[PDB]
Ligand binder design. Structure first.
Ligand SMILES: O=c1ccn([C@@H]2O[C@H](COP(=O)(O)O)[C@@H](O)[C@H]2O)c(=O)[nH]1
Ligand SMILES: O=c1ccn([C@@H]2O[C@H](COP(=O)(O)O)[C@@H](O)[C@H]2O)c(=O)[nH]1
Ligand SMILES: [Mn+2]
Ligand SMILES: [Mn+2]
Lengths: 284, 284
């Protein structure tokens, strides 16, 4: 049950004025595509605070990637869900190496020890298993939404409750302007992640996805179970977990899509006019 | 739990091409505003059919307004949720006067007898009470969504599952291009429906709203309970049920907004370029 919003003064939405004239702001299945200019964060903050929303943020820092945690967490404190309850979940093989980052009120961090796989591909892939196992262990009881990201990144601008929805994916920065045939989906029919050349809405990035705990457990379990089928058949998808994520989100459409503002690499791609904000970016 | 979509071939969405350049297609709270060109009905039909969705449609035909039923129902059969399960609920003081309209498969009609109020204003207002009472009686057990409309109307074009969402309102055709100060909200602070001149997102029409059964029961109960407070205080809102609906949807934002394609009057307003389809229109 949702309590009433208070009186708020803000600009009237104008029906005959598009909010963006340069980009698609809604998918063909009526999911919003989140760009700057599409939302009034004051309204959304009120809606989510009245629900006392808690957001979980999972990040894996295994082997040398522990070096990325300090900047990741410091910048999350400046930009990620500020004003809301946040629970960071740091999965690592080196609990002792997690930096002591000072957190704002209503924010907490748990360190979860996991095994390290030898190949980076298996480290990246086995996040799905680990996230889906922790959905029972903790997440169902502790958070309303989960956001699952890569650690070799930093926040540079606001990432807030505009992203929250039952299931979201993010447009990969390398492909948002590409035609589907150019998308690096898995193309071998032998793999569970196979997508034909004439199918595909978007190429979603494996480095940023999330949703409600229930929808994330469904996604991660499905991707893990597909990976295990492939492994039994002696095949590894071309882009690992990202390939399985794309298969899942083709067949189970997200309820919001994040623009590449939310997953960017300035070294490789610069700062195009279409991006008004670079929010979460690669560490070069 | 949502089963996987089958393979489908359809045009790729292009991220750098707006779907409409002449209208707002998403509210500032990230609710889609449904216009032609914003959705692929093939995808949405698949999603809703895989859930075996049933849609209820309530309509009141009291006193002389029984004359409108034949065209209303005949045209609903041509255009409303075709392919999906539909349950019409006709509330009337003259059960015997409901026309025998032939229905397609998976579609049914129930006639619910109710009392007739003397004043048209009370007929229109007391729909809220009657809808909220029937949410327990029947709707919770029989349908997934409810659509609540005026009867003095006809369908001329597709009205389908693109509208379905937890809570929707529709832009009133007289005000979609107006500034909020011109909106005919209730402006007397003595009324529960009062909205100040500096508040308001849109002017929603009382002739077309809906959502999930739970959200419609909440809306209709709140509007009824506000009407009863006003009555006790000797005040009747300027636009009756529509005024209370607007107060509710200001404080409880809809999760989709329908464009005026869904609520139109060609006699008064013609056929502007911005309307690509006139879907549900006034009988002159
Ligand atoms: O040795 C590794 C390999 C990958 N990852 C995690 O998996 C993510 C995806 O792998 P990558 O493509 O960024 O290497 C990394 O950002 C990091 O969170 C590790 O922690 N350690
Ligand atoms: O005598 C009346 C008055 C109103 N209505 C119902 O209430 C709706 C709203 O009233 P109106 O403004 O269209 O008259 C009508 O479309 C019709 O569904 C009736 O059935 N009979
Ligand atoms: Mn990386
Ligand atoms: Mn009327």
């Amino acid at each position: 049950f949702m309590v009433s919003l208070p009186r708020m003064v803000y600009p009237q939405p104008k029906v005959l004025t598009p909010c963006r004239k340069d980009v698609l702001v809604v998918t063909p299945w009526l999911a919003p595509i989140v760009w700057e200019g599409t939302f009034n964060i004051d309204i959304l903050n009120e809606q989510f605070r009245l629900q006392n929303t808690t957001i979980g943020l999972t990040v894996f820092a295994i082997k040398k990637y522990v070096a990325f945690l300090k900047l990741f967490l410091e910048t999350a404190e400046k930009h990620f869900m500020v004003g809301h309850r946040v629970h960071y979940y740091v999965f690592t093989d080196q609990p002792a190496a997690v930096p002591r980052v000072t957190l704002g009120t209503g924010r907490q961090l748990s360190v979860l020890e996991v095994r390290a796989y030898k190949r980076w591909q298996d480290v990246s892939m086995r996040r799905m298993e680990m996230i889906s196992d922790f959905c029972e262990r903790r997440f169902l009881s502790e958070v309303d939404y989960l956001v699952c990201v890569d650690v070799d990144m930093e926040f540079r601008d606001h990432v807030g409750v505009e992203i929250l929805t039952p299931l979201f994916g993010t447009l990969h920065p390398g492909f948002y302007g590409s035609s589907r045939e150019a998308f690096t989906y898995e193309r071998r029919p032998q793999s569970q992640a196979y997508i034909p050349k004439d199918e595909g809405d978007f190429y979603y990035g494996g480095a940023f996805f999330g949703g409600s705990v229930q929808e994330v457990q469904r996604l991660t379990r499905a991707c893990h179970q597909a990976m295990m089928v492939d492994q039994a058949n002696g095949i590894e998808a071309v882009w690992h977990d990202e390939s399985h994520l794309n298969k899942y989100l083709l067949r189970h459409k997200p309820t919001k899509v994040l623009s590449p503002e939310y997953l960017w690499d300035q070294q490789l791609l610069g700062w195009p006019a279409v991006l008004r904000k670079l929010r979460f970016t690669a560490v070069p």
